[PDB]
């Protein structure tokens, strides 16, 4: 089960996977804030628009629940 500050692996509906720290949640707007996030791209998930890993580290990335295909703790 996830908690504040845990390491989250998050696959968006575009099959792109993100790793970041769970900073907080907004239950009203169903949004999720990750911190120190990196984009791993589409990896081995099939798609006609493949994305490779990006090096950049993002300060904050905000996801809606409807953006989330899958979410797991590391």
């Amino acid at each position: 089960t996830p908690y504040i500050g845990s390491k989250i692996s998050l696959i968006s509906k575009a099959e792109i996977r993100y790793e970041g720290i769970l900073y907080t949640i907004d239950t009203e707007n169903s949004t999720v804030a990750l911190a120190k996030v990196r984009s791993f791209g589409t990896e081995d998930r099939p798609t006609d628009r493949p994305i490779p890993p990006r090096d950049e580290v993002f300060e904050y990335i905000i996801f809606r629940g409807s953006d989330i295909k899958d979410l797991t703790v590391c």
């Binding site: 908690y3 900073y23 907080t24 949004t31 629940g65």
Partner: protein
């Protein structure tokens, strides 16, 4: 909605406030 990914207890307890939404003039003018 978010219950699909997060425990019941977590959605209940007090959470840290969201960071301030900081938008760029590019996105603001491009969208709406």
């Amino acid at each position: 909605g978010l219950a699909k990914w997060f425990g019941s207890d977590m959605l209940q307890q007090p959470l840290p406030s969201m960071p301030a939404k900081v938008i760029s003039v590019d996105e603001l003018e491009y969208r709406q």
